[PDB]
């Protein structure tokens, strides 16, 4: 169940309300200000890292379950999403539907959106690719 959720469900959830549109209408006060803007933030693919922990001083390193248990840390990985920031603008001629056009500003980077706890012995855990000897090295019980 966890493997299905991490592999497929996470992408599906972010592809439901990915688009956020903020429309700044004409605001007719003078004819030098008659343009209407439209800002759009859209979410693309989601990426997941291996389990990791960030210390107080800001250093991030891979976290293994044995250290997490001893140090009262949460065994979790990071989630990243590709975000596209588009802006269209159109001339708001009075009493007409607008023709929004891309105004040559389409920024397109990975954004951290939180940490996902990882179930042990799962596809995203460090112990799924470990042999019996590897588990013994990592102080894990086969």
């Amino acid at each position: 169940s966890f493997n299905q959720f991490v592999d497929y469900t996470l992408q599906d959830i972010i592809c439901e309300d990915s688009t956020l549109i903020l429309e700044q209408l004409a605001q007719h006060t003078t004819e030098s200000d008659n343009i209407s803007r439209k800002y759009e933030i859209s979410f693309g693919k989601i990426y997941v890292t291996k389990p990791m922990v960030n210390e107080s001083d800001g250093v991030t390193h891979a976290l293994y379950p044995q250290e997490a248990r001893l140090r009262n840390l949460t065994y979790s990985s990071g989630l990243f999403v590709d975000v596209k920031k588009r802006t269209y603008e159109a001339i708001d001629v009075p009493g007409r539907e607008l023709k929004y056009e891309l105004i040559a500003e389409e920024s397109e980077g990975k954004v951290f959106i939180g940490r996902l706890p990882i179930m042990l012995r799962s596809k995203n855990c460090y112990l799924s690719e470990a042999t019996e000897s590897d588990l013994y090295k990592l102080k894990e019980c086969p």
């Binding site: 903020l22 700044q24 605001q27």
Partner: peptide, 9 residues
């Protein structure tokens, strides 16, 4: 005058 900011779905 409008709210000068609204969300389209």
């Amino acid at each position: 005058l409008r709210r000068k900011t609204r969300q389209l779905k």
